[PDB]
Write a protein that binds this ligand. Structure first.
Ligand SMILES: Cc1c(C2CCCC2)nc(N(C)C(C)C)c(-c2nnn[nH]2)c1-c1ccccc1
Length: 133
């Protein structure tokens, strides 16, 4: 139920530092350039204990379904195969992706009428803001 504030269709409206975050993660040039152009929709739904987050774009469509606290396999939009765990911490969805001894954290938070996504890899943070579509 507190997860209700996330449900819906969200469209990217701004992005800051995403190229440098992608570089830090290890995304190659071509994928950075093409991925960086996209204005994805993020579609969030809940059925019972299962949360589904889909991203749809010109570049790639991705979909994950998960139970909070329960690790799962994810193939990311940049084609990493990762092990992911998503929890709710103080009203924020915290998504940790682990692969090859590395880790990145993606936070999704509701702020005003936006969904704000903060992505961190080592010292590099990117902020992506989505609005209802
Ligand atoms: C490539 C990519 C990445 C990876 C870049 C480096 C590591 C993660 N993360 C995303 N985030 C952070 C999601 C998890 C919120 C999105 C993304 N942006 N909106 N939805 N998905 C995209 C993306 C998807 C399709 C079109 C362009 C961009």
């Amino acid at each position: 139920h507190m997860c209700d504030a996330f449900v819906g269709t969200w469209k990217l409206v701004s992005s800051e530092n995403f190229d440098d975050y992608m570089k830090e993660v290890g995304v190659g040039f071509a994928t950075r350039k093409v991925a960086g152009m996209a204005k994805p929709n993020m579609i969030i739904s809940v059925n019972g204990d299962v949360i589904t987050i889909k991203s749809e774009s010109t570049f790639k469509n991705t979909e994950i379904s998960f139970i909070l606290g329960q690790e799962f396999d994810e193939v990311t939009a940049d084609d990493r195969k990762v092990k992911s765990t998503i929890t709710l911490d103080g009203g924020v969805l915290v998504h940790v992706q682990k692969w090859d001894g590395k880790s990145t954290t993606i936070k999704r938070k509701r702020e005003d009428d936006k969904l704000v996504v903060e992505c961190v890899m080592k010292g590099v943070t990117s902020t992506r803001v989505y609005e209802r579509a």
